[PDB]
Amino acid sequence: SDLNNAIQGILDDHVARGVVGVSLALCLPGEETSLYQSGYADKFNKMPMTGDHLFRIASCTKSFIATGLHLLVQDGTVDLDEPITRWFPDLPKAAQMPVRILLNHRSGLPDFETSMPMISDKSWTAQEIVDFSFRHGVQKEPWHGMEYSNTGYVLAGMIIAHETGKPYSDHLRSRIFAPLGMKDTWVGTHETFPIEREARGYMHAAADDENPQWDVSGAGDPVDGVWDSTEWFPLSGANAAGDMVSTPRDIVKFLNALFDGRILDQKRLWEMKDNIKPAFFPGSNTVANGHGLLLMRYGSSELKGHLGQIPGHTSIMGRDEETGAALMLIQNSGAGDFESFYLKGVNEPVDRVLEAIKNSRS
């Protein structure tokens, strides 16, 4: 179709900017999911990117952890409005922290991500990450305003574990991946995934990587302008804040079912997507968030989903509630700085795709 060719052209144009590769899944109302790729999964072996290549979805994990939590609310064992002192009696300020603030980025919790060594072999514990966060991050007052919080999601994972007596991967697998037939999806902290199937991630030695967001000491020298950063960072370190591995295909499966009401009941779905306040994420298109979902604006279209940044894999997922479209675009180029083209520029092909869909519909 004309749309197919337009979208493929958009992806080709983006890799021609110097992005190594890109993998997209797009489902449109009344249609099957279409997959599109451009560029390479492996820069040095020149392996073509396919729709079967696995990616670290980074913070897109947060939407699944939110879903897991909202499901335990459905089971009647968790109340979104009850204090987390029940699970974390000694966590500073926990009495002023309802369950919902763990998901909505207004907890004021100290964060770990900017302090955590990215290049290491360290197997992290959830409690260890929380401890690490309080040691090195700055705590604000609950409800101070919106500041993106990874710690809130690590804590959410700990509730899931405590209320199910098992790792949070079990709950997510049994309640989300299995019933939806997501066969190429893993939870990195608690599951082994086939590394050989994963697209390589590339950090670029770019001029606009001025203010890096991660401690990337120990990187060595760049080869052909990049570092292979695929296996730099322990997924256990990201934990419930960003440890998942998946394919665009599988992510669109999840998104379709979530917004079709086949995972969460109507109240819990509303909590996730519609009970929103303003939200900011540097370099992104984010304008608002609910309880597991970011609202990201692309001119006259909007996605309800999430962004993901983990060294070398840069992801945008979401559903356009107006048009009914669901997408996951992941590139295997990144940088450290939020404002780098290699990070923030992932929003450009997403923007173009949505306007191509819109024009095909005019």
Convert 233-250 into a string of H (helix), E (strand) and C (coil). Answer: CCHHHHHHHCCEEECHHH
Q: Which residue is nearest to Ba ion (CB)?
A: 362
* Listed ranges 119-127, 214-222, 303-311, 344-352: which one lies at the site for Ba ion (CB under 5 A): 119-127
* Options 1, 192, 217, 362; binder of Ba ion; rule CB under 5 A: 362
CA distance 126 to 56: 19
Beta-sheet strand order (sheet of 301-310): 47-48, 33-42, 21-27, 326-331, 313-319, 301-310, 294-298, 286-289, 277-278
Q: Which of 19, 11, 31 is CA-nearest to residue 356? A: 11
* Listed ranges 103-111, 282-290, 310-318, 354-362: which one lies at the site for Ba ion (CB under 5 A): 354-362
| Per-residue tokens: 125 | 């514990």
Shortest distance, position 319 Cβ to Ba ion, whole Å: 14
x/- track of binding to Ba ion for residues 286-325 (CB under 5 A): --------------x-------------------------
CA distance 149 to 100: 13
CA distance 333 to 338: 13
Which residues in 72-101 contact Ba ion (CB under 5 A)?
none
> How big is the CA angle at 124 (ends 119 and 125), to the nearest 5 degrees?
165
1 binds Ba ion (CB under 5 A): no
Shortest distance, position 184 Cβ to Ba ion, whole Å: 23
Shortest distance, position 95 Cβ to Ba ion, whole Å: 38
192 binds Ba ion (CB under 5 A): no
* Listed ranges 11-19, 114-122, 272-280, 310-318: which one lies at the site for Ba ion (CB under 5 A): 114-122
CA distance 4 to 1: 5
For Ba ion, which is the closer residue by CB, 38 or 285? 285
Number of residues located near Ba ion, criterion CB under 5 A: 4
358 and 295 in contact (C-beta within 8 Å)?
no
State the residues that interact with Ba ion by CB under 5 A: 121, 300, 359, 362
